Design a protein around this ligand. Structure first.
Ligand SMILES: Nc1ncnc2c1ncn2[C@@H]1O[C@H](COP(=O)(O)OP(=O)(O)OP(=O)(O)O)[C@@H](O)[C@H]1O
Ligand SMILES: [Mg+2]
Ligand SMILES: [Zn+2]
Lengths: 49, 623
């Protein structure tokens, strides 16, 4: 479906912004592993230091 | 005189003020205090004054039973004219303290007397004109309260002709005192009280209302006004039944009698003693806490102690415990906030006892606040600026979310909130802070609280054939801020019916007139654990957690379900932190990780449609 259909308002509102960022959640083994490692590292306290 | 006081000269008030009999009864009371002893032979009053001096107190409690048994005549005269004898017995107590302790007047210039165990007990509707200026004992509920005000005790005056400051003159708490003669000037001109050289005391007014249970059918409760002086202020907050001992007297000052109409008077009660009709601990309790913690299987020991008045619903009770204990908040360089409060949602069919779990949580938490989207409640959900009906002052009040900072906010009938309540809830859950711009005030308030909510599905019954998002009137932004979603279905089964029915019928038949940790210790355990335990993680479970997360992601995407997102990993870590806190340990074990994994995976699977649900049951059978 078109990005205009995905939103829930008049499509002319999108004409007002300067930059648009449609971020998608694609599934990937290595990216999931990397993000999980990052998050548990943050929670443990290493990324704090 | 010597116990000849049974002879009556004239009215009792006149008799009790003669200097000779005054001295007689003063010595008699001093002998009572110095000599009284029970069978055990210990100096009960001696110990009372000893501890009084040790603690640097201001008042002595006295038993009416002992005094009556010893000195019936004094007891009777106290019951008749207590106003006079309170003064002399205060002096007796002061001299006793001086005898035991030196230079007590250095710190405290007064020692009040509190009576106790008065035989007759009245209700606010029984007082009449034969009780005036006498001793009474009543009971009721506290309905409204004032602040603490300063009242004059030792007034000092300024002479306007010469700057002399006339010495202290006692204020008797009967009528304002004045002066008319200056020793220096020999004058009589204007005077003004000196505020910087005067000593004051504490004053407070309280309204007592009868307990509704005791009112015979067909009538309405009565009420009175009470006066609390010195260290009786801020002892009985609104909403608790109390027993008050005091002197029943008219408002003799009134305003004036030129008022037209029948000459009627108002009355008050001046309180002498007040009593009530915890989460602290000590070394004795701390050792027992640590001993109980060391035992294996303490988590299931705790879970069985949640809501004893309900049968089954083990998942609900474990989730309740998890959200009632809580995780640990984090902040990386003070620029990335992670919350530590675990939120739960109850979505069940009618007659599933959700309100009972909420009531239990309210009665068991240290700081729990009750709100609701429909009905009467002591507080709303939005902050506002509003008048005070008694002080006539503007005030800034937050909602139940602000009021329960570092606590738990309970919301009943979560499906019936209006736009304002929904906005407030969303802001509190998303930012943990509430803003306001009203009546010239712009500020932000902290809203770091835990939320436990109950709702109902559309139509009153659960449609298991559709996803949970289509069973409730709520929206994704709000629904995605919960950690544990609990779905209750009233599926018809027999054995469950016998178990629940026997529970209910037995409960009813016990209440006809004619393993688990004790609750009182559990409260202190919870307070101490939240106060003193901040468990920590180890980097050796990262591989396990990452593998489990990858498996969950892959299966969820394969089966076309609601997406599994990193929020579930964070919820798992929070629940593991809470499980570790349950044990008083300082580190996150692997068993806690397993329990958190089970909880979150089961919550996620139970909230899908039948086909997807049954597909996901096989895949995640490891847990
Ligand atoms: N499983 C149960 N065990 C014991 N008592 C129960 C159980 N389920 C319901 N009850 C009792 O039945 C009545 C149900 O009323 P309650 O307000 O507790 O239900 P609810 O699930 O909050 O429903 P709702 O608010 O939709 O009416 C109460 O007396 C409750 O004590
Ligand atoms: Mg209910
Ligand atoms: Zn003068």
């Amino acid at each position: 479906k078109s990005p205009g259909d995905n939103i829930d308002f008049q499509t002319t509102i999108l004409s007002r912004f300067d930059m648009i960022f449609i971020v998608k959640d694609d599934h990937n083994e290595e990216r999931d592993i990397s993000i999980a490692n990052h998050v548990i590292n943050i929670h443990t306290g290493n990324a704090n230091a | 005189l010597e116990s000849l006081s049974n002879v009556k000269a004239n009215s009792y008030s006149e008799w009790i003020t003669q200097p000779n009999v005054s001295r007689t009864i003063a010595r008699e009371l001093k002998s009572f205090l110095l000599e009284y002893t029970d069978e055990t032979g210990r100096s009960v009053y001696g110990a009372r004054i000893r501890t009084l001096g040790e603690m640097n107190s201001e008042s002595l409690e006295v038993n009416y039973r002992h005094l009556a048994e010893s000195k019936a005549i004094l007891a009777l005269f106290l019951a008749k004219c207590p106003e006079e004898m309170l003064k002399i017995f205060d002096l007796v107590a002061m001299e006793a303290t001086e005898l035991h302790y030196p230079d007590y007047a250095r710190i405290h210039s007064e020692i009040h007397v509190r009576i106790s165990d008065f035989p007759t007990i009245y209700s606010l509707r029984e007082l009449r004109e034969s009780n005036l200026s006498s001793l009474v004992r009543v009971t009721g509920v506290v309905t409204r309260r004032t602040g603490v005000f300063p009242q004059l005790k030792y007034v000092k005056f300024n002479c306007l002709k010469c700057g002399s400051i006339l010495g202290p003159f006692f204020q008797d708490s009967n009528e304002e005192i004045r002066i008319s003669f200056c020793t220096n000037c020999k004058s009589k001109g204007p005077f003004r009280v000196n505020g910087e050289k005067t000593v004051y005391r504490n004053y407070q007014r309280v309204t007592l209302q009868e307990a509704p249970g005791t009112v015979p059918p067909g009538r309405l409760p009565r009420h009175r006004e009470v006066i609390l002086l010195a260290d009786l202020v801020d002892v009985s907050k609104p909403g608790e039944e109390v027993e008050v001992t005091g002197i029943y007297k008219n408002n003799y000052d009134g305003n004036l009698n030129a008022k037209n109409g029948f000459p009627v008077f108002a009355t008050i009660i001046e309180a002498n003693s007040i009593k009530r009709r915890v989460f602290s601990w000590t070394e004795e309790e701390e050792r027992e806490f640590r001993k109980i913690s060391r035992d294996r299987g303490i988590i299931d020991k705790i879970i069985s102690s949640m809501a004893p008045s309900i049968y089954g619903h083990r998942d609900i009770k474990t989730a309740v415990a998890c959200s009632l204990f809580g995780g640990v908040p984090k902040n990386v360089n003070g620029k990335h906030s992670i919350r530590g409060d675990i939120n739960v949602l109850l979505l069940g069919d009618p007659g599933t006892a959700k309100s009972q779990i909420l009531k239990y949580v309210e009665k068991t938490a240290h700081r729990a606040v009750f709100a609701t989207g429909q009905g009467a409640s002591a507080v709303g959900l939005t902050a506002s600026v509003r008048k005070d009906p008694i002080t006539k002052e503007w005030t800034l009040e937050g909602g139940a979310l602000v009021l329960a900072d570092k606590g738990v906010c309970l919301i009943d009938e979560f499906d019936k909130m209006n736009d304002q309540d929904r906005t407030s809830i969303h802001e509190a859950m998303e930012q943990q802070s509430i803003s306001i711009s009203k009546a010239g005030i712009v500020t932000t308030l902290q809203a770091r609280c835990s939320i436990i909510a109950a709702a109902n599905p559309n139509g009153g019954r659960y449609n298991s054939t559709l996803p949970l998002a289509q069973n409730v009137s709520l929206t994704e932004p709000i629904l995605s801020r919960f950690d544990i979603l609990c779905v209750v279905r009233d599926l018809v089964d027999e054995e469950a019916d016998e178990r629940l029915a026997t529970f209910v019928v037995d409960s009813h038949v016990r209440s006809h007139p004619e393993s688990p940790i004790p609750q009182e210790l559990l409260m202190k355990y919870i307070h101490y654990a939240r106060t003193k335990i901040y468990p920590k993680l180890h980097q050796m479970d990262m591989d396990k957690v990452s593998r489990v997360y990858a498996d969950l992601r892959r299966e969820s995407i394969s089966t076309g379900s609601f997406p599994i997102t990193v929020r579930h990993l964070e919820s798992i870590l929070r629940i593991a932190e809470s499980f570790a806190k349950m044990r008083l340990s300082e580190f996150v074990s692997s068993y806690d990780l397993d329990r958190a994994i089970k909880v979150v995976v089961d919550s996620f699977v139970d909230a899908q449609k039948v086909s997807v649900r049954r597909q996901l049951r096989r895949s995640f059978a490891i847990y």
